[PDB]
C-alpha cells in the first residue's frame, strides 16, 4: 500500500504498511474515578462487558469511531480514552513492546522458537512459558510500554517443509499443535474464559496459512485449494481446540484466499465456522493480518478498491484492521452504501469488550496491575528459557560418543552456528538479557576450547577450511555447529529447497577423516536432509537443536558434556531433498495422488523414505515397555455417545480408554522419558493414513532400574476420521495404539455399532454464491 | 400425524398432535437444597445460565435427553429434574395452565383481544396488562399448574382482512405492532434483558404467516412468495423489534414456507436473520409451531421423512419442537449420521439457560415465587379488563345521537351479539371470573330494557324478525349488536368474505324504517363491508366493538350512555367487500400490481375507498389541533448519523424531530384524545406509499376548553424505507408528518446529504442452495 513504485504483490510478499499501523504507542488506562467517563455505562462495574463497551462507543462521533478501527487506535482525547495499540507479539517471549535502550524494560526473556518448544513434549512447558510471558507483558503495560493483548500463538500446522515461518508453529501435527495452543493460550488469558482477562490471546493464522512466497507464490495473492474433507480434519482443529476448549478471545484471519476467497472476507470461515461451528466466545474479535484487508482488493482482486475491501471484510466478521484501510476507508464504504454506522461500530464494541473484561477500566488496583520490573527479573532468574531448551533438543544419532567420555579434554568448535547472537532468537523477539552461543557455551564448560569458523552458512569457500582442519587436528574431540537460520527461512522467504546450505557438508566431510568423536548441530527450524550424516559412520553423533533461545549455547554444551540428558524429539518429518522438488509446495492435497506426483504429506500420509522420521528422538539410556492389556477388547459407538459424559461439554471430549504402559530405565543414567501415542486403523473409506497422533507425555527423572507408569487418555474425538463432507464421523473397525516409532508397545480395540458423526459441518453456501 | 384415516394437510389447517404432545403436566421445582442436582453445577448460583445449563444436559443419558426435546419434556426422574410443559399460552389473559374446576385457580382475567386492546392506541396500556398476565402466570406456575414460558405475543400483521387470526394482532400496522410487541414481551419477562427473568416470552409467528386456510391454502402447506425488499420492510420489523429492542427470549418458527423453505426448517430466517442480523439472545430459543417440523416433511415435502425434517429444523436453529417429532425420530437422525448428540443438545440446553435465569433451580426465596392466588384476585380486582375495553372500542358513526340524551328510558337490544358468553373472549382465553354481555351492560345501566333476538349471526330465516321489530317500536332507543365471530374466523378457518354474516343487514335495515334513534355495534376481529350503514342517514350510530372481554358489556353500555367516552381508532382497514373477491388472498405482495388485479394491501397501499380508514375513530366532543412550526427544515443524513448517539445501541434509534401539536377540547364533553402520526415521502424509490405511521400517542381527560401538548418523538430508523435488496436506507429528500387521517396538522421536513444504509440486509444464500 505505502510502495513508491510499481509493487507485484502475487510475487512480493512483504506489504509496504503505513507509518499510523506501525507506530508504537504510549499506553495509558482511562480514569473511572475522575475522567470524563467517570460518571458513564463503562465505568459501571456492575454492567456486562458487552453493556459497558457499547455504551462507551455510543458516545463516539463516527470521525472517532473510525480512527479507532484499526490497530493504531488513536483514541478519543474529549473522552479521556487513550490511545490503544492493538498490535502486540508474544510468540516465545513479550515481542513488540516499546523497549527502552538500557536498565528497566530494556528487554525481556527469549524461549526458544515454539518449535523447540513442542519438540520437549511437555504441556505443562508450554504453559509454564505462557505464564511468564504473560507476566512480562503485564509488566511492560503497567509501565506505559505496550498493550494487553498479543497477536500470539501461531498455531498453523508446518504441513509443507520448505515454509520460511514453520519455525514459529508447533510442527506438522494437528494434535500437538492443538494441544499447545490450548496451553499457550490458557496461559496467555489467565486461565479457561476467566473472570479477569490476563492478556488476550490471538489464534493466528485463520486459515490455509502455510506458504509466503515459493516460486513466487506469494502469500499476499495464494488461492489455496483445500476440500472441505482436509478443512475440516487438518487445516481448521487447532483453531476449533482455540475457540471452543481454550476460549480464546481473538483470531487473527490470514492474508491468503482459500476456495477463492481471501479468509477476512470470508463469510464461510468467520461466520458460518468460526462463530456458529467452534463456539467462538460471544465478545471475540477477528483481527485481520497486517495489509490482509488491503490484500482482499490488491492483489486478490475479490473487492474492486480498499473501500470495498473494508465494507466485504467488516461485514464478514472482521473486527479490527491491521493496517490503515479501515480507518483510511471506512467513511468512503458508509457515504458509497456499502455499510451502514452500526456495522463499523460491531467490531470496536468487541475489542472494549475484551479491554473491559481485562480490567482496563476499573483504575490501578485491579487484578494484574501490580506487576512491576521486579517480575521481570524473578521470572527471568528461573531459567526457563534454558530448561525449554535443555527438553526440546533433539539427539538423531549416536553410537558410544555422547556424551562426552571424561578422557575429553578439549574440543574443535567449528562452523557457521558456534559464534552467533540473535541467530538463537529465531523470529518476533524482543532484546534478550543475554545470547549464549554454543562457543561460549563450551568456554563455559571448563573443556579447553579451540575456535575455527571454518565455513559461514552459505559460502562455496573453501578459505576457513585449513585452520578448522588443524583446530580438529589438535583436539580430543570435535564440535560442528551448522544448518540454517533466518538469513535462509523467514516471514516472506520460503526455501527453495530442503538441504544443508553452502558447503557445511563438505566440511563435516573433511571433518569426519581425522580420527576423531564428531558431533554435528544441525540447528534451524525447517530441517534439512542429513541422509549424508545418517550413513557416514565417522559422523558418531547428530543433534537437531532448533532455535534455542537466549540460553541456548548452556543448554547444548550442557547435553554435549552429560550434565543434562536428551529426551525431545522431532515435531516434523525430515524429508529427502527430492521431496521439495517432485510437486509444488502450494499443493494443499495431504492424501498422496500418484496422477500428480504428491507423494502424500506429513508422517500421517507419506509413502516415501523420511531420513528421520516425525517423533525421532534418542535418549542416554534404555528403555523397557510393557503393557498390562495388549487388548482393551471392544466399545460400542453407540454406547459411548450415549451414555451421560458429566464433567464435558459435548459427549466425544469423553476418555474412550487410557493407552496404559510400564516403562523401565534398563542403562546407565537417569533420563527424562517421552512418548508419542499413534493411532491407525483400516476403519472408514480408503485411503487410510499411516497413523496419527493421538497422545503424548514425558515422564520425569527415571533413575536407573525404576519403573514408570505412562497413562495417556485417548479421547472419543482423537480416533474420530472426517467423512468427504467434513463431518467428524466415529467409524466401526480394528483399530491399533501403539507407542512411539518403533511400536513398542501396541494396544488393540474394536468400535462397534453405527457410524456417528460427532460435529456436523456446515455447507458452505457463501464463497461461491451468484 | 395422529390422523385416523388420509388426511391432505394441503387443504386441512389443523395438525393432528399426539397426545404426549397436547399432554398438561403438574408443575415443579428441582430440589438444588437436598435433591441430586444439589452437588453438581447447576445448582452453582455463582455460574452463567449457561454454564449451569451445559452442566445439566451433560448428566443426561441420550435416551433422556431426546425425551426433553419436544414441548411436553418428561423430565429425568433420575436426576430429580421435573417434567416441564414449553406449551403455555397467554395471548391476552392466562390460556393454557392447568386450571380446576372451582375456586383457587379455577379462572384468570380475559382482557380483550389484542386487536381491541391495540385500537386504545395508549403503549402504556400494552404494558401494565401485559405485568398483570405476568403476575397470574407465576401465581399458576407456583401453585404447580403452568410453566414460566409462554406462546404470547403473536405480532404478526393483520395484512389481509380474511385471515382467521387477524384478531389476535395488533393490526395491519409494522409500527403499532411493534410497540406492542416491545411492551408486552418487557412486561412478561418483567423488563428489558432483567436480573430474573419472570416469564419466558415468545414472539410469534416467524415468519410471512398471516393466511389459515382462504381458497382451501392451508398454512400447513403454503409456500407464500415475498420479496427481500417487502420481508425486510413489513413482515419482519416487528420480530426485529422484539429480539432487538424487547430481548424476547423466545421466537416461535411458523408452520407455513417462505420462498421454498419452511420456516423452521429456513437457515436464512433462523440462523442469518434472527440470530446474526437482529442481535436474538444468545441464550435465546427457537420453538416450532405445534406440528411445524412434521409439516417441514408431510405436506410441505422439503424432507423426504420425519427424521429428515427433525434434523433439518435441528440443523437451521429450530431448539424445541412443539409437537412429537424430535421426541420420537430424534433417535432415528442420530443413528442415521443426520445429526450429532451435541446438535441435539443445543436447543434443550439455549430452553434450560432460560429457565436458570427465571430462577428454576434457584429454590422457593428466588424472584417471583412468593406469588399466591391473592395476586390474581387483587390485579384483577383493578378492573383493566374494563378500562381496556372502554379505551379500545371505536365509534365509526355517530350524529350526536351518542351519548344517549336523558329523554331515553327504555331500548330495545336485539341481534345476535347481544347475548353472548365467551365470544367475548375471541380465542386463546382461559376461563374468565364473569362474562358480562352487551344485554347485561344494559340490563345494569338502569335504564329499560326489551330484549329480542332478531336473528342468530348466521341466519337465512326470518322467523325473530316480528318479535324484535315490535320490541324497537315499544322502545325509545334501539341498539343491535351484531358482527362475527370466532364461528367465522378462527385459527384453521380464514373467512371467503369480509360481508356482514347471514341477514343481519336485512334486520338493521327493517330496523331503520321506525324512526327511531338506531345504534349499531360491529363486532369481531375483522372488519366486515359497513358501507350499507355509513350510507343509511338513519343508522345514526356504529361502533367497532371487537373482542371485548370479561367486562365488555360494561364498557359498551358506559360509552353508550356517556359515563365514558370513546377515543379508539381502527387499527386495521374496513375494506369494500369487492376487495375479498378481486385478487388472491396469498398474493403477499403490498405494491399495487394492476396486471394481477391487486390494488395495493393495508392503508399504506390500497388504491381503492375504504368504507372506513386505519385510524378512523370520533369523539364526543371537538378537538382544535395546531403547532407553531409547520416547517421543521433540513437536516443532513450524514450529519444525523455521525454525532455520538448517548443512551442508544444504534445512531438510527435517535430521536430526529419531535412531531408537537396544540390539542384543545372545543366542546362540551371532558375526552381522551388519539393521535396517529404518519409520514409521507417521494424520496427513495417508486412506488411510493401513500404514508406509514411513525408515531401514536393517547392524551388524558382534555376537560372543555382544555388544551394539552402532544409531543411524539419521530426517529431516525422510522423514516427510513427499504430499498430492492432490504436494506433499511435513509433517503435525501420532501417529507411531511400528518396529524391523523384529515391531516389536521402538517410539518414539513428536508432530508440533505446522500442515502445512508442504517440495517445491512444480509443475502439469502441458503434458500436455494
Ligand atoms: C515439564 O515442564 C514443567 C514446567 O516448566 C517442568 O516443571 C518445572 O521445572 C522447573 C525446573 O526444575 C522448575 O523451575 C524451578 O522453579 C523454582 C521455583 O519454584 C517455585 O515457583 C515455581 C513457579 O511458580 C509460579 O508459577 C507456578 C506455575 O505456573 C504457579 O503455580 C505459582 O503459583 C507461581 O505463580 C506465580 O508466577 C506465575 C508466572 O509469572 C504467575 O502466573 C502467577 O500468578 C504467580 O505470580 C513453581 O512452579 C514451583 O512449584 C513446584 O515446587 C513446589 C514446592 O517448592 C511444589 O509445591 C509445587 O507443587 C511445584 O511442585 C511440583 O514441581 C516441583 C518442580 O521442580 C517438583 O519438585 C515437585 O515435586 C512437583 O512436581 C515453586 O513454587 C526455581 O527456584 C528454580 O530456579 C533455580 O534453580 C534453577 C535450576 O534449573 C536455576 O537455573 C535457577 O538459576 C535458580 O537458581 C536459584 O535458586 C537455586 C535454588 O534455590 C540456587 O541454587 C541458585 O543460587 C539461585 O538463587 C527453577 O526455576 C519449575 O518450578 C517447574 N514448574 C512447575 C509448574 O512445576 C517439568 O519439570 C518439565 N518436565 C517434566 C518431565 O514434567
Ligand atoms: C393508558 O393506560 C394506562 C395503563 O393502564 C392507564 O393508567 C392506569 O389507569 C387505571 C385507571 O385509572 C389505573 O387503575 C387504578 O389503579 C389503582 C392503583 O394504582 C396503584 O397501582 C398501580 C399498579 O401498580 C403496579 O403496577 C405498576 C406497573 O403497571 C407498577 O409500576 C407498580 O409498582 C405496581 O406493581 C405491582 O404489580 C405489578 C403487576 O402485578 C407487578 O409487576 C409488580 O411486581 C408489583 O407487584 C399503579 O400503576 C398506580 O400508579 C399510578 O399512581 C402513582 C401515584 O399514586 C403514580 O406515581 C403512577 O405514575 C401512576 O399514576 C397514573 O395513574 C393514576 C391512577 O392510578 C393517576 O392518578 C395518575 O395521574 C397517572 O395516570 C398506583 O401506584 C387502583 O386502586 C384502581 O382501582 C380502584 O378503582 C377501580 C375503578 O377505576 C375499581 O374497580 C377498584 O376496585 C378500585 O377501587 C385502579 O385499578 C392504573 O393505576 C393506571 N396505571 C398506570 C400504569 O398508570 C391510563 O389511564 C391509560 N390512558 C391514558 C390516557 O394514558
Ligand atoms: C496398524 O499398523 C500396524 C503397523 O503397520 C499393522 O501391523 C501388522 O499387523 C498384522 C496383524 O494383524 C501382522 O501380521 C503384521 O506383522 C503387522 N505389521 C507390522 C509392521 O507390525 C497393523 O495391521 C495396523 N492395524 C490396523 C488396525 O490398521
Ligand atoms: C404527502 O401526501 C399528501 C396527500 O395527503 C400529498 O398532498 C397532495 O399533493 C398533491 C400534489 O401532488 C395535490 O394534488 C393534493 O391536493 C394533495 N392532497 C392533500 C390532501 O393535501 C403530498 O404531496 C405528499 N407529500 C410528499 C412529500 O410525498
Ligand atoms: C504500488 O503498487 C501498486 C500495484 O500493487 C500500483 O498500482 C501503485 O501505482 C504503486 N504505488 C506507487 C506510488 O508506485
Ligand atoms: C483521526 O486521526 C488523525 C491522525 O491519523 C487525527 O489527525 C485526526 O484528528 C483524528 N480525528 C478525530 C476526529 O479525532
Ligand atoms: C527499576 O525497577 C526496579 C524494580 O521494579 C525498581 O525498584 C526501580 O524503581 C525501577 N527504576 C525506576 C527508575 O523506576
Ligand atoms: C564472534 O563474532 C563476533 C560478532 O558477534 C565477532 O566480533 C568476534 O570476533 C567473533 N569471535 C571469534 C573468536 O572469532
Ligand atoms: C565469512 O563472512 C564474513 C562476513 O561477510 C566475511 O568477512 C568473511 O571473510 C567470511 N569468512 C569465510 C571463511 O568465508
Ligand atoms: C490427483 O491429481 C490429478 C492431476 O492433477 C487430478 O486430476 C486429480 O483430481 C487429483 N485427485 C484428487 C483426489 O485430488
Ligand atoms: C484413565 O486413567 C485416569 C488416571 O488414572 C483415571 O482417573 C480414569 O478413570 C481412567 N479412565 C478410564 C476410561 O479408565
Ligand atoms: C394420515 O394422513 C397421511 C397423509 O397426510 C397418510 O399418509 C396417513 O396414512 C394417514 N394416517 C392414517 C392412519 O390414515
Ligand atoms: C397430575 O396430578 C394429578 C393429581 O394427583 C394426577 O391425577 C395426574 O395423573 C398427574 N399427572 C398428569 C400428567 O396430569
Ligand atoms: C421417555 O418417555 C417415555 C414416555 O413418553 C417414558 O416411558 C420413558 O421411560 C422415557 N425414557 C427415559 C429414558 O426416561
Ligand atoms: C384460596 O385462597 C385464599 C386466599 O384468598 C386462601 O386463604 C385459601 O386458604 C385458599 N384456599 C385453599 C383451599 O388453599
Ligand atoms: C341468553 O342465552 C343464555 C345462554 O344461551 C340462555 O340460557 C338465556 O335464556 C338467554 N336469555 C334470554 C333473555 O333469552
Ligand atoms: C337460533 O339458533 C338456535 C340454536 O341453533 C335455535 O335454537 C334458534 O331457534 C334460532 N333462532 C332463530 C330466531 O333463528
Ligand atoms: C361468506 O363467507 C362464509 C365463510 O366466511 C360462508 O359461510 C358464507 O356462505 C359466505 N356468504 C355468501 C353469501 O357466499
Ligand atoms: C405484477 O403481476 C404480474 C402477473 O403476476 C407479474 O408478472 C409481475 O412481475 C408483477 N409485477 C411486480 C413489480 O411484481
Ligand atoms: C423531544 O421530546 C421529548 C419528550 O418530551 C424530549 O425529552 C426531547 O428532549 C425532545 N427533543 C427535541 C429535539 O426537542
Ligand atoms: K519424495
Ligand atoms: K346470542
Ligand atoms: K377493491
Ligand atoms: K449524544
Redesign the interface.
Known sequence: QANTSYTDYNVEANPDLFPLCLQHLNASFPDCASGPLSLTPVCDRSLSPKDRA?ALV??????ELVNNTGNTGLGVSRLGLPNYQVWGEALHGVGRANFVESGNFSWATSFPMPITMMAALNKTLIHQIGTIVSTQLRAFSNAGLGGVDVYSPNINTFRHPVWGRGQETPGEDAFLTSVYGYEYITALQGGVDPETLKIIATAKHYAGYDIESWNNHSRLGNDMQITQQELSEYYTPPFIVASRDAKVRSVMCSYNAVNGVPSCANKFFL?TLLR?TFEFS?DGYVSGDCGAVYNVWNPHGYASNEAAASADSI?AGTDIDCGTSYQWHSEDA??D???????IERGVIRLYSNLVQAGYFDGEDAPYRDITWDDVLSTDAWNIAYEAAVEGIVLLKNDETLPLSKDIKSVAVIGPWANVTEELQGNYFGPAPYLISPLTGFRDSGLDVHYALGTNLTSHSTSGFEEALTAAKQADAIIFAGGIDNTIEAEAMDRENITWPGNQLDLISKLSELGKPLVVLQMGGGQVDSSSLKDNDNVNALIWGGYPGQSGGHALADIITGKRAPAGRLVTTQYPAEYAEVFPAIDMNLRPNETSGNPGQTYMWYTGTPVYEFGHGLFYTTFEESTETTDAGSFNI?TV????????????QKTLLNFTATVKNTGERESDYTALVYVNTTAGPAPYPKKWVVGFDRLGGLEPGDSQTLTVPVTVESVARTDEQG?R?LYPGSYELALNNERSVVVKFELKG???????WP?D??SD?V
Not at 455510543?58 to 470521525?63: E, N
Not at 452504501?337 to 456495522?343: F, K, T
Not at 455417545?641 to 466425544?652: F, I, K, V
Open positions: 457499547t455510543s458516545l463516539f462521533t463516527f470521525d461466520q456458529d460471544e461485514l458508509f457515504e452504501s456499502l455499510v451502514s454506522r452500526s456495522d453407540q455417545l450415549t451414555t451421560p459424559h458429566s464433567g464435558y461439554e459435548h459427549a466425544q463431518n464421523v453405527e457410524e456417528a458423526v460427532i460435529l456436523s455447507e453456501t457463501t454464491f
